[PDB]
Design an enzyme around this catalytic site. Structure first.
Site, PDB file in Angstrom:
ATOM      1  CG  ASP A 458      -2.010   0.857   1.206  1.00  0.00           C
ATOM      2  OD1 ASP A 458      -2.700   0.750   0.175  1.00  0.00           O
ATOM      3  OD2 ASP A 458      -2.318   1.583   2.176  1.00  0.00           O
ATOM      4  CG  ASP A 665      -1.467   1.710   5.766  1.00  0.00           C
ATOM      5  OD1 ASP A 665      -0.914   1.348   4.707  1.00  0.00           O
ATOM      6  OD2 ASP A 665      -2.197   2.721   5.838  1.00  0.00           O
ATOM      7  CG  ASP A 669      -4.178  -1.889   3.225  1.00  0.00           C
ATOM      8  OD1 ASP A 669      -4.284  -1.482   2.050  1.00  0.00           O
ATOM      9  OD2 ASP A 669      -3.665  -1.209   4.138  1.00  0.00           O
TER      10      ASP A 669
HETATM   11  F1  ALF Z   1      -1.766   3.755  -0.222  1.00  0.00           F
HETATM   12 AL1  ALF Z   1      -3.208   3.010   0.516  1.00  0.00          AL
HETATM   13  F2  ALF Z   1      -4.646   2.260   1.256  1.00  0.00           F
HETATM   14  F3  ALF Z   1      -3.850   2.638  -1.105  1.00  0.00           F
HETATM   15  F4  ALF Z   1      -2.573   3.393   2.138  1.00  0.00           F
HETATM   16 MG   LIG Z   2      -2.390   2.550   3.826  1.00  0.00          MG
END
Ligand code: ALF
Ligand SMILES: [Mg+2]
Length: 774
Positions: A458, A665, A669
């Site tokens: 992420d 996080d 996710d």
């Molecule tokens: F970068 Al993300 F959920 F897509 F923290």
């Molecule tokens: Mg995140």
């Protein structure tokens, strides 16, 4: 609910109350069918989905409330039966193991050591009719409850292996224990009916085997993992209750009730207090506010809400009241979808095939085709008299000597400490790994993390820090750099925005650069901020204009090459990371950026070195994703992805063969965290992210992913060992058991010096904890 609401009556113990409730509900039309579960003190109300609702039905339930209790009704679910069941299973296996000990340790304190020592040896060797000593009777009586009560597990496991399977561990334990026990019974009965027949009973091994296998089963449960996951945290994200509106608009007048969110249905209206969890997803009717939506994007930019757009449930607004007509309810909300995805992912995680079953699949056939050949040895050597007659023991026939050697193979070949090979490590990684900064929420995670070949990441929170920071800075307004940030922060007094916090932090960093934080600022005089513009104030009699082109042209500040030098890539256009931050005049800019990735660069490089690829499935802007991935070194950059798509990418990479791992996080996710073979959650993320992963990273460091993979590889090494060290002691005791040595040394099977191989076997299974390599 709206289809079939389960109304478990509360405070109801007499069928008359149930019948009164039933009559009141039958007096109400609209319910398709009432499943009358009179036995169980519950009533089932089945009717059409997406119509009317619980409310009137629940009021009808309440209308029967009479002493001694108030007649609540709602589906009741096990609150902590999970933890209670975990504790109870651990306690049950512990109790079975201890009960096995409190009869086996008797047998082994008896004829292993006490017979060696007097006066107890004399009493044990004090004879009874013919040659059966009281020791044999005592051991036969003591080991019998073990084998025939505590061992029902093993017998039923063998009988359920039967032919549907080939040979599990249960059949191996069955052959070992039963062979030893029945041969001991044979020995005792013969000593009873003979006059010189000697020979110790193998009652020790049969009882002592049960202890070790139970120990393995106990350690299996303990090392299985912490109490599953607790999905529930997702449900707690939505508020349990809200306020109905029915206000102003023609008929809608005053009705500020406090109905719970569950009873809220289609075509409803809600109030949404400024700064509270949005009840469900809906379409706003009137009101202007910004919502900290982190259920799809996962990022903390307050997104705009004008009358007409759709608000997502389980979100938090900040700027005032939002008036919503309710869209999809119940199982069609975003939180609902997250719940089904995570439940499906978790419920489809098939357990790994323990190599103990694989080993026992072939090993059990090997023992039988070895004992039989051992019998097909000595026996045929008796018919043709190759072996000298005097080798046979007293009062035994050639068949008996073959049986003594043949049954001996079965007893010694049983591996004993084979269950104690995977769980005997108690996953020491769950241990040393915790010190390293990795908490494994099970053993399945460790088992599957070694074969990880691809890992998703992420961006916000996981790769990048997440809280914006002003890092790639320059100069600008016609005042010193220190005075630049001084006046900026002065304007940021009343302002409490994320970028405000970032500006303050950069100001602190420059105060460190510029000595210390000498003196201070004053409040945002003439707080002039304009929509979009930025932060404007007349702090210290200085009308500062920290912001963008609207606020520059508000005082007519020309736009030039630095509005063309600090965004787009990250630092190639408008004068902070993607945004404002130029203060009053222009000589350069700032960069209110997401604070890169302190060590994630080397982390990704090291991950690529060990063959593990790297993916970045974020939910933020394509432009932001581009620069971050380019700088760190990630490859594919699939962005603008919803939680469902995040799960889809994991599933797709799984389909191509690789075993992947999700590192995340946020609540975004979670569907991907559960779906992945081994999910890794950053310990600084959302609590439900910690909830849904298999590994949680306490120290926020992407290098901990490398540590986790290494700790998972080094526990597959030394789990192939401790299978080698488990089998080998019995395997290189099988020739001794068969009597290969007997022709060439004249030494038969020692009842002790080859039956106590499990002591060597189990103690040989030791696990070392010396890891970490950064
Ligand atoms: F970068 Al993300 F959920 F897509 F923290
Ligand atoms: Mg995140």
């Amino acid at each position: 609910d709206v289809n079939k609401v389960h109304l478990k009556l509360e405070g109801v113990s007499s069928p008359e109350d149930i019948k009164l409730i039933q009559s009141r509900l039958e007096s109400v039309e609209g319910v398709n069918n009432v499943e009358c579960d009179t036995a169980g003190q519950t009533i089932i109300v089945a009717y059409d989905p997406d119509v009317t609702g619980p409310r009137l039905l629940i009021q009808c339930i309440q209308d029967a409330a009479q002493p001694p209790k108030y007649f609540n009704a709602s589906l009741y679910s096990p609150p902590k039966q999970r933890e209670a069941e975990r504790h109870h299973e651990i306690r049950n296996y512990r109790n079975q193991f201890l009960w096995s000990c409190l009869f086996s340790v008797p047998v082994f304190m008896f004829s292993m050591v006490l017979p060696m020592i007097s006066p107890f040896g004399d009493w044990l060797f004090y004879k009874v009719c013919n040659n059966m000593t009281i020791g044999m009777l005592l051991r036969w009586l003591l080991c019998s409850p073990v084998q025939f009560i505590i061992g029902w597990r093993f017998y039923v496991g063998a009988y359920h292996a039967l032919k549907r399977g080939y040979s599990n561990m249960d059949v191996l334990v069955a052959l070992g224990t039963n062979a030893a026990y029945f041969y001991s019974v044979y020995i005792v009965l013969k000593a009873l009916t003979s006059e010189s027949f000697e020979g110790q009973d193998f009652f020790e091994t049969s009882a002592m085997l049960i202890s070790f296998i139970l120990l393995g089963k106990y350690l299996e449960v303990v090392a299985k993992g912490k109490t599953s996951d607790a999905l529930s945290k997702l449900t707690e994200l939505a508020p349990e209750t809200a306020c109905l509106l029915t206000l102003d608009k023609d008929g809608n007048a005053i009705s500020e009730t406090e109905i719970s969110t569950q009873l809220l249905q289609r075509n409803d209206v809600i109030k949404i207090v400024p700064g509270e969890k949005v009840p469900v997803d809906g379409v706003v009717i009137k009101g202007q506010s910004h919502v900290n939506e982190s259920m799809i994007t996962g990022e903390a930019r307050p997104i705009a809400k004008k009358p007409g757009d759709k608000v997502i449930g389980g979100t938090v607004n900040d700027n005032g009241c939002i008036i919503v007509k309710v869209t999809h309810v119940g199982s069609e909300t975003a939180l609902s979808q997250i719940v089904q995805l995570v439940e499906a992912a978790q419920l489809a995680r098939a357990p790994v095939q323990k190599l103990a079953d694989r080993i026992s699949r072939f090993f059990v056939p090997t023992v039988v085709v070895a004992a039989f050949l051992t019998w097909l040895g000595w026996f045929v050597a008796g018919q043709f008299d190759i072996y000298p007659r005097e080798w046979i023991p007293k009062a035994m026939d050639s068949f008996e000597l073959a049986l003594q050697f043949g049954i001996s193979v079965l007893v010694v070949a049983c591996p004993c400490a084979l269950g104690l090979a995977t769980p005997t490590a108690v996953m020491v990684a769950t241990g040393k790994g915790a010190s390293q900064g990795v908490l494994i929420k099970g053993g399945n995670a460790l088992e599957k993390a070694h074969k990880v070949k691809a890992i998703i990441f992420d961006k916000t929170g996981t790769l990048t820090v997440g809280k914006p920071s002003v890092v790639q800075t320059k100069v600008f307004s016609k005042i010193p750099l220190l005075e630049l940030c001084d006046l900026a922060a002065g304007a940021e007094a009343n302002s409490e925005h994320p970028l405000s916090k970032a500006i303050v932090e950069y100001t602190k960093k420059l105060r460190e650069q510029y000595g210390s934080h000498s003196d201070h600022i004053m409040e945002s005089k003439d707080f002039e901020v304009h929509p979009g513009a930025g932060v404007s104030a007349n702090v210290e009699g200085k009308l500062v204009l920290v912001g963008n082109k609207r606020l520059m042209q508000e005082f007519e500040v020309p736009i030039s090459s630095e509005v063309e030098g600090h965004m787009s890539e990250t630092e190639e256009l408008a004068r902070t990371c993607v945004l404002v931050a130029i203060d009053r005049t222009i000589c350069g800019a700032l960069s209110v950026s997401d604070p890169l990735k302190p060590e994630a660069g080397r982390a990704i490089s090291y991950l690529s070195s060990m063959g593990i690829s790297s993916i970045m499935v974020t939910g933020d802007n394509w432009a932001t994703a581009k620069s971050i991935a380019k700088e760190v070194g990630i490859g594919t950059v699939f962005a603008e992805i919803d939680p469902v798509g995040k799960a889809e990418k994991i599933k797709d990479l799984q389909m191509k063969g690789l075993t992947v791992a999700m590192v995340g996080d946020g609540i975004n996710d979670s569907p991907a965290l559960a779906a992945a073979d081994v999910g890794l959650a950053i310990g600084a993320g959302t609590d439900v992210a910690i909830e849904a992963a298999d590994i949680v990273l306490m120290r926020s460091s992407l290098e901990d992913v490398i540590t986790a993979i290494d700790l998972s590889r080094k526990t597959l090494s030394r789990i192939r060992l401790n299978y080698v060290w488990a089998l080998g002691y019995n395997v290189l005791g099988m020739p001794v058991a068969a009597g290969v040595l007997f022709p060439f040394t004249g030494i038969r099977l020692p009842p002790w010096l080859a039956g106590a191989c499990m002591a060597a076997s189990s103690v040989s299974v030791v696990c070392s904890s010396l890891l970490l390599q950064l």
